[PDB]
Design a protein around this ligand. Structure first.
Ligand SMILES: CC(=O)N[C@H]1[C@H](Oc2ccc([N+](=O)[O-])cc2)O[C@H](CO)[C@@H](O[C@@H]2O[C@@H](C)[C@@H](O)[C@@H](O)[C@@H]2O)[C@@H]1O[C@@H]1O[C@H](CO)[C@H](O)[C@H](O)[C@H]1O[C@@H]1O[C@@H](C)[C@@H](O)[C@@H](O)[C@@H]1O
Ligand SMILES: CC(=O)N[C@H]1[C@H](Oc2ccc([N+](=O)[O-])cc2)O[C@H](CO)[C@@H](O[C@@H]2O[C@@H](C)[C@@H](O)[C@@H](O)[C@@H]2O)[C@@H]1O[C@@H]1O[C@H](CO)[C@H](O)[C@H](O)[C@H]1O[C@@H]1O[C@@H](C)[C@@H](O)[C@@H](O)[C@@H]1O
Ligand code: NA
Ligand code: NA
Lengths: 311, 302
């Protein structure tokens, strides 16, 4: 319809501290730049074009996000993946089931249970671990491998990653949440992976939203999980499907108390935000978390942003 | 601002009492069922009630401080900000699962170590003297012989309440937020059956744990969480007694049923006798706002 093709672009009118990470369900705790200025990312969750087109394994909502479901035989180590709702995973069409975790360079410590409940007593929860750099980690081929033999009843199991730690192999490897796992194998590459996102250059830098995920690391610091878009943005774009009318959407990060602009950002149609750091050490990490991004105007990709933060 | 609801299929939307996809749309088994959920409560002009969070990120989490050797978790908000006692039933997003024991998994935050499994299992009874979230604290079943600190987590599975004996899980109920000397302030009010041919619609999702029926633990809620987020963001003024919605098949554009969304944040329909109701409908439909209507607007039976 005319209304559909002329629908004005909008973003959710909710402060950042109230929005959610799109790589796992949790409130956003901060904005950062990548420590390495040359960092290329290829996250498979939290990927959505601003006209509402989902990419990779990205779910429309938080409900499928960061869940794992599959069938496993008693005495086996192989979890044969399905979609979160139990329907078959059509492999070769996607890197993994919708919402499947994209945490690379770490051991996964999972909690799962047999579904649906058919018990009248007892604790249903089971702890399993998954290494992602072993030959058995082939979600694109429809399966992942647990570390130990699964001595529990054959059936349909659902759960999630509860905490993460350094990869078991090779020794001395630290967690790196900037990376995704290898979804395929040596004989078969992962098909329909969401594309990489490169640093924009020319004074601009990618902005990442971070939330702490449980687990230790070599720095004795939180495992901060970076993502490109709040999940609420993704849901909003999927619902609205507003046509993209320019090269980039100019956003102002506005202080709700004073109505003053705290920072200028560009939201690119590919579903990521950039800013211009105001010198070395400056960036969006210096901004308070109670601001609201407001859509100002469609702009050219060449439009220059006022630098953000203080050196 | 014109009123709208999200353009997303129901099966893709989330429960507002815990983060999970909606798996069903039902009437209460008891037609006289009164509910008083504290989560999933939002006026349709975007005003949150009870303990309801604006978004899923805050929903169904518990955070607080606990000392090594103690049983008491002194609650904060999910982001770590102080919780004000006597003001509300519990911190925003605090679970509202009544009539069950809670089996939780929690961990000390932020991480400050290079080694070890951080996860701790604790259990909470909600009908005991020590369950006083309105006063800012809850009591674990056992002494917490783990490091002192700031802990965050959630309920992992539920089971029958420990007391009194022979009590089964009833997720239609909420816990007793109050104390021996003080009732909980600012509880979201009860929602009563509408009568006059109409019935409340509930969205259900299964939660882990055993029960006496050896079947799923079904959690009913009044609104999808995404609707709540949408209303909070949009702040569209309520301009009639009820918002008439059509539940539409997106593949064919066929209207599958008429519903009324009331200002208080709940949906009704008219069942076409016994056996009829919204549970007969496919879950891939999208609700669409049609018009503001009066309270006495007669819905076509579903
Ligand atoms: C404290 C505990 O573990 N209670 C168990 C109970 O345990 C024992 C019974 C007898 C001895 N003994 O010989 O000396 C030792 C331990 O075992 C019963 C029967 O299996 C458990 O009740 C059953 O499972 C529950 C999950 C419920 O489905 C219940 O209806 C079943 O009958 C009992 O578990 C506790 O039951 C309580 C209700 O009566 C309540 O639900 C409580 O939360 C349950 O405790 C949890 O589940 C246990 C299996 C265990 O994991 C415990 O740590 C949990 O808190
Ligand atoms: C298999 C295992 O449990 N490995 C542990 C290791 O455990 C033992 C040490 C010594 C004996 N013994 O003398 O007989 C027996 C068992 O203990 C080290 C610490 O000394 C653990 O490594 C440390 O904690 C990890 C969580 C990481 O942060 C790591 O960097 C720390 O050094 C080690 O845990 C395993 O470390 C692996 C990396 O080297 C990898 O991260 C793996 O996932 C870890 O195993 C998990 O965490 C354990 C604590 C345990 O809960 C296990 O079940 C998990 O899979
Ligand atoms: Na692989
Ligand atoms: Na109480």
């Amino acid at each position: 319809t005319i209304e559909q093709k002329t629908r004005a672009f909008t973003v959710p009118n909710i402060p950042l501290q109230t929005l959610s990470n799109s790589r796992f369900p949790s409130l956003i705790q901060g904005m950062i730049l990548s420590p390495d200025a040359s960092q290329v990312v290829q996250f498979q969750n939290g990927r959505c074009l601003i006209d509402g087109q989902l990419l990779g394994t990205t779910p429309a909502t938080s409900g499928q996000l960061f869940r794992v479901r599959g069938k496993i035989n008693q005495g086996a180590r192989t979890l044969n993946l399905t979609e979160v709702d139990g329907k078959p995973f059509m492999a070769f069409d996607s890197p993994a089931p919708v919402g499947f975790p994209d945490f690379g360079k770490c051991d996964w410590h999972m909690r799962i249970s047999k579904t649906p409940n058919n018990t009248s007593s007892g604790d249903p929860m089971r702890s399993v671990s998954v290494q992602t750099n072993v030959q058995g980690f082939v979600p694109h081929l429809g399966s992942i491998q647990f570390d130990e033999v699964f001595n529990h009843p054959t059936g349909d199991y659902i759960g999630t990653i509860e905490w993460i730690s350094n990869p078991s192999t090779p020794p001395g490897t630290d967690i790196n949440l900037w990376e995704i796992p290898d979804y395929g194998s040596s004989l078969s590459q992962a098909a329909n992976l969401a594309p990489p996102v490169f640093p924009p250059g020319f004074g601009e830098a990618l902005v990442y939203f971070v939330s702490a995920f449980p687990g230790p690391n070599n720095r004795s610091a939180p495992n901060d999980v970076p993502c490109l878009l709040p999940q609420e943005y993704i849901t909003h774009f999927v619902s609205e499907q507003a046509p993209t009318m320019g090269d980039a959407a100019l956003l102002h990060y506005v202080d709700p108390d004073t109505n003053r602009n705290l920072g200028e950002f560009k939201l690119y149609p590919g579903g990521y935000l950039t800013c211009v750091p105001n010198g070395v050490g400056a960036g969006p990490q210096q901004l308070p978390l109670n601001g609201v991004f407001l859509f100002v105007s469609w702009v050219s990709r060449f439009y220059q942003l006022k630098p953000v933060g203080t050196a």
